[PDB]
Amino acid sequence: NLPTAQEVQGLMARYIELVDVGDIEAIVQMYADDATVENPFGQPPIHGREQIAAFYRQGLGGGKVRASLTGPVRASHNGSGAMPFRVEMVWNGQPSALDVIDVMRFDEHGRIQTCQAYWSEVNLSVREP
Template sequence: MMDTQLIRRRMARYVELVDAGDIDGILSLYADDAVVEDPVGAPALTGIAAIARFYREGLGRAEVSAQLTGPVRVTGNGCGAMPFRVDMHWNGEPCSLHVIDVMEFDGQGRIRSMKAYWGDLNVERRPE
């Protein structure tokens, strides 16, 4: 059985690192051969180089804040899910993006798969 508390802490840490804009910190959570699908349905990004490019070209060029909006849920077999919100500017407008990330972890507690569930219906405009 995997360490469920470790997974819970790593997932919460992921949101903290997104909030801080710490791309290197985010990347350190991933396995070298990880796969990211953000959002689900987009082409999968495989390997740390592709994942690094995704974060540097997205998060690295935006001013965002992030916070958990509910508890992290963890299974005993190395998987977890969490709801969180990312506040940012979308098409020049202040918006909040409501996301659920589902992650699978390897035996060393590194993310081997991340799927982000969100779409246009999950973006809401915020007052300035």
């Protein structure tokens, strides 16, 4: 059915794990086939599994990415949630840290229908040697 609050918390936390390990295949599996992704929010939405997989491919690729929850997943009783996390990756050839909040809405099958990632350069920090 439609993910309960606790179920949302588990799903969104799993998402972060798949990202941390770069399991593109599993990430895309979590998405509905008609899902939309806006990342960073304010960019044109990307639609469907093909484009979503392409997005994760170029992002979780050649790069060198880590991600971890920095706080509890906030979950509603209508299949949505939001979570704070931190991403470690290379930005402009330098080791960087990005603070992000993702908002996700799930369908009655527990697949991500909508994901929106909130962050910009103000949330980017370039780490010293």
